[PDB]
Structure formats: structure tokens, C-alpha cells
Amino acid sequence: QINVIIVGLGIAGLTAAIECHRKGHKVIAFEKTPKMMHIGDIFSIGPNAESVIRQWKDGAISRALNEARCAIDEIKVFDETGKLQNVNTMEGYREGEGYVINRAEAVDIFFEYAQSLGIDIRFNSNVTEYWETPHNAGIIVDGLKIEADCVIATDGIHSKARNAICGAVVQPKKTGSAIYRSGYAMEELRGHSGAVWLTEGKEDVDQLYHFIGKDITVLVGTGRRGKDVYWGCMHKSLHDVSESWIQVSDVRRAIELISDWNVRDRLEPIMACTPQGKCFDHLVMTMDQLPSWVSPKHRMIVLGDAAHPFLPNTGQGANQAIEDGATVAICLELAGKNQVTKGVQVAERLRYQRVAKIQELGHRMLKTLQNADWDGDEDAPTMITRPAWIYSHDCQQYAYNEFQTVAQLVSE
Numbered sequence: 001q002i003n004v005i006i007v008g009l010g011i012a013g014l015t016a017a018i019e020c021h022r023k024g025h026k027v028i029a030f031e032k033t034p035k036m037m038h039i040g041d042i043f044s045i046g047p048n049a050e051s052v053i054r055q056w057k058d059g060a061i062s063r064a065l066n067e068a069r070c071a072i073d074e075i076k077v078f079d080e081t082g083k084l085q086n087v088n089t090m091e092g093y094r095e096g097e098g099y100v101i102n103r104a105e106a107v108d109i110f111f112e113y114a115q116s117l118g119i120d121i122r123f124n125s126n127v128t129e130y131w132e133t134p135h136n137a138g139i140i141v142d143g144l145k146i147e148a149d150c151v152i153a154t155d156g157i158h159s160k161a162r163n164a165i166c167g168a169v170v171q172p173k174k175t176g177s178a179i180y181r182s183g184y185a186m187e188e189l190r191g192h193s194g195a196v197w198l199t200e201g202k203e204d205v206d207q208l209y210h211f212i213g214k215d216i217t218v219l220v221g222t223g224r225r226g227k228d229v230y231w232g233c234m235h236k237s238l239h240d241v242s243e244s245w246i247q248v249s250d251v252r253r254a255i256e257l258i259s260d261w262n263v264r265d266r267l268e269p270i271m272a273c274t275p276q277g278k279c280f281d282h283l284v285m286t287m288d289q290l291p292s293w294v295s296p297k298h299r300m301i302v303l304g305d306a307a308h309p310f311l312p313n314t315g316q317g318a319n320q321a322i323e324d325g326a327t328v329a330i331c332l333e334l335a336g337k338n339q340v341t342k343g344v345q346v347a348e349r350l351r352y353q354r355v356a357k358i359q360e361l362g363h364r365m366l367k368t369l370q371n372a373d374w375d376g377d378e379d380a381p382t383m384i385t386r387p388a389w390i391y392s393h394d395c396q397q398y399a400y401n402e403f404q405t406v407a408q409l410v411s412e
């Protein structure tokens with residue numbers, strides 16, 4: 001039986017823990033916060049991650065995500081003047097495909113499942129020290145050495161593990177954009193006469209709007225059939241007021257960003273009714289491609305945002321974190337106890353080029369999105385591209401199919 005240490009329990013670490021446990025490994029998982037604590041905005045989980053999730057507990061996790069979904073039928077795309085420019089379908093996010101869902105709700109569902117499986121989960125563990133030998137690897141918690149066969153570091157874009165595992169040459173860096181993200185109860189908004197366009201007449205169907213202007217994108221949506229309201233704002237900034245870490249926002253700053261938008265009259269009420277503490281902001285950070293995700297003695301690997309952050313317009317960060325977790329569990333299973341380092345190296349090789357291709361697509365799309373060149377549809381600004389090579393990929397089948405080939409190359 002393979003002993004795995006997992007550090008960081010966001011989507012990446014929770015998926016790795018669940019999948020490692022399901023594939024028969026013994027997991028010890030470490031988390032810095034006292035309990036799950038996530039921003040209550042929304043994110044999307046597409047089919048390439050649903051094919052992992054659908055296997056858990058005879059579909060009960062998928063059904064719980066489905067119950068909690070934003071029941072969105074279409075995306076309405078406007079320019080900054082308020083002109084409707086495009087209506088997109090929700091292909092990839094309809095029943096049985098995928099979900100737009102409250103982030104904290106989804107993490108709670110994953111966490112509740114991981115805990116139900118009996119996985120050893122240790123909160124209040126801020127991990128900074130890693131070590132490995134030819135024979136084992138582990139961490140240092142409270143001056144105590146914890147040993148395992150391998151360490152999976154899924155501690156996010158500000159990973160402390162990454163310096164230890166990959167060295168410190170490559171660091172996260174500012175893109176020049178920043179983001180406001182918010183979710184709150186619709187009861188706080190409904191009654192505002194400037195919000196009737198959102199709050200009335202929608203007959204139990206959730207909404208999702210994109211407002212695309214030069215260097216500023218605003219998104220507005222609802223969840224749980226009108227019970228929750230969500231909004232956010234990604235914008236290119238000349239002088240930073242946001243930081244590389246997340247902060248609670250003063251929403252009055254976001255209102256000023258759209259001061260020159262004709263539609264501001266529609267959007268200001270949604271921002272202004274945000275309760276104190278329910279809007280967050282941060283710089284949009286990126287990172288150059290790491291030469292390697294794996295430690296010199298091949299027992300430690302960074303996965304998730306610690307290894308390959310994506311621009312938020314991609315909508316793939318959580319999906320690829322889920323693919324990473326499912327993949328590493330398989331590589332360890334196929335490698336077996338006596339060749340754990342081979343499994344770690346195969347896991348990196350299986351994923352490395354795919355995630356880089358997704359990162360590069362996100363960078364190209366962000367440029368078009370922020371140019372907002374509405375005159376000139378395959379040239380139009382959009383957050384929506386659903387290429388088959390992303391959405392039809394089955395990471396588990398890929399790992400089972402390619403392991404032997406890739407392992408042979410690793411072994412030589």
C-alpha cells in the first residue's frame with residue numbers, strides 16, 4: 001500500500017485525496033485553514049471533470065452538485081452601451097454535462113465526501129518544510145517528521161511547496177489585470193428599482209450576463225433559481241489597488257471602474273447592494289511554464305494552481321485540478337509501491353503539454369476579450385470557446401492507455 005501525503009485541500013487536493021483513496025492508497029492530507037473557507041462566488045465544472053465526479057458514490061456527488069447548480073439556459077452578451085451582441089448556449093453545462101455552481105458549496109460537497117470516506121484530514125497545518133530521500137519523502141509539521149512514499153503539493157498559486165520542489169527561479173507574476181468577485185443573497189437586492197431587469201420576470205430560471213467593454217469585463221448571474229446573486233469584474237489596471245493575495249473589497253471602487261459605461265445604471269445596483277465582506281478582489285496572477293513539477297529525487301509533485309495557474313476567463317482551473325488528481329492516483333496505482341517515483345514522473349508527463357496548451361489558449365482569448373472589438377463572430381470578444389480537445393478529453397482513460405508507454409520512456 002502506497003502512502004501519500006497531500007498538502008492543501010482546495011479542489012486539487014480534495015480530488016487527489018478522494019481519487020488516491022479510491023485507488024487504494026493511504027492518504028494523509030494537510031490543510032492550513034481551520035476548516036473549508038472559500039469565497040462564495042461561482043465557478044464552472046465541465047464534462048471533462050464530470051466524468052471523474054460521476055464515478056463517486058453511484059452518482060450521489062453529481063446529483064448533489066446538480067441540485068445546487070445555477071439553472072442557466074443561455075448567456076446574454078452585451079457591450080458597454082447595453083446593446084445585446086450575442087446569445088450563447090450552455091453546451092457543456094446542462095444537466096448531465098457539467099455545472100455552474102457556488103464555489104463554496106461545491107468545495108463543501110467534495111469535502112463532505114472525502115471526510116465520509118474516512119480520509120485522515122488535518123486542518124491548522126501550515127506546511128512549509130519538505131524533504132525527500134531515495135527511499136521516502138515527507139514534510140515537517142510541528143517539528144515532527146511525517147513520512148510517506150510521495151508528497152502531492154496542491155497548495156495553490158502561492159505554493160510554498162513549489163520553491164522546495166521546483167526551486168525558486170520561476171515565480172508567479174502580475175498580468176496587469178485585477179478581479180472583483182462577489183456572491184450574496186438575492187433578498188439583499190430585490191426591491192431595488194434599478195435591479196428589476198435582473199430580479200423580475202425570470203420564472204425560476206437562473207441568469208448569466210457578460211458585459212464586455214474595452215479592458216473591462218463585468219459578469220452578472222444568479223443561482224439556485226433566483227435565490228443567490230453573483231457578480232464580478234475583471235479589468236486592466238494602470239496602478240494597482242488590488243494585491244496578489246485576496247482581500248475583502250470596497251465595492252465602491254468597482255462602481256467607479258464602470259463610470260463611463262452607458263449600462264452602469266443597470267450594474268451599479270448589483271454592486272452597491274453587496275453586503276460588507278461579500279466582495280473580494282485580487283490581481284490576476286499568472287506564471288511561466290515550470291520546467292518540471294517534480295522534485296529532484298522524483299517523490300514530490302506540484303499539481304493544481306501550484307503548478308499551472310490559468311487566467312480566469314479560461315474556466316478551466318478547477319477542471320484541470322480535478323484531472324490532475326484523478327491522473328496522479330492512477331499513475332501511483334499502475335506504478336505500484338516499488339516504483340512510486342516512476343508513477344510520479346509519468347503523472348507529470350501525462351499532463352504537462354495539455355495544461356500548457358490550455359494556458360496558452362487562455363492568454364490568447366484574454367487579449368481578444370479585453371480588446372472588445374465588436375466591429376469585425378469568430379473574431380468577436382467572448383469568454384466562450386468549447387473545443388473538443390478540451391471538453392471531450394477523458395483523463396482517466398488517457399492515463400490507463402498511455403501509462404505503459406510513458407513509463408517505459410521514463411525508465412530509460
Ligand SMILES: Cc1cc2nc3c(=O)[nH]c(=O)nc-3n(C[C@H](O)[C@H](O)[C@H](O)COP(=O)(O)OP(=O)(O)OC[C@H]3O[C@@H](n4cnc5c(N)ncnc54)[C@H](O)[C@@H]3O)c2cc1C
Nearest residue numbers: 008010011012032044127155156304305315316317318319
Ligand atoms: C474569478 C475566477 C473564476 C474562475 N472560474 C473558474 C471556472 O469557471 N472553472 C474552473 O474550472 N476554474 C475556474 N477558476 C480557477 C479555479 O478557481 C482554480 O484553478 C482552482 O480553484 C485551483 O484549485 P487548487 O486546489 O489548485 O488551489 P486553491 O483553491 O488555491 O487551494 C489551495 C489550498 O491549499 C491551502 N494551502 C495553501 N498554502 C498552504 C500551506 N502552506 N500548507 C497547507 N495548506 C496550504 C489553501 O488554504 C487551500 O485550501 C476561476 C478562478 C478565478 C480567480
Ligand SMILES: CC(C)=CCc1cccc2c3c([nH]c12)C(C)(C)[C@H]1C[C@]24CCC[C@H](C)N2C[C@@]1(C3)NC4=O
Nearest residue numbers: 041042043044181182219231232233234312313315
Ligand atoms: C461573476 C464572478 C463570481 C466572477 C467574475 C469573473 C471574472 C473573470 C472570469 C470569470 C468567469 C466566471 N466568473 C468570472 C464564471 C461566470 C464563474 C465562469 C463560468 C462560465 C460559464 C460558461 C462557460 C465559461 C467558460 N465559464 C467561464 C466563466 C469565467 N464565464 C462563464 O460564463
Ligand SMILES: [Cl-]
Nearest residue numbers: 357358360361
Ligand atoms: Cl492552445
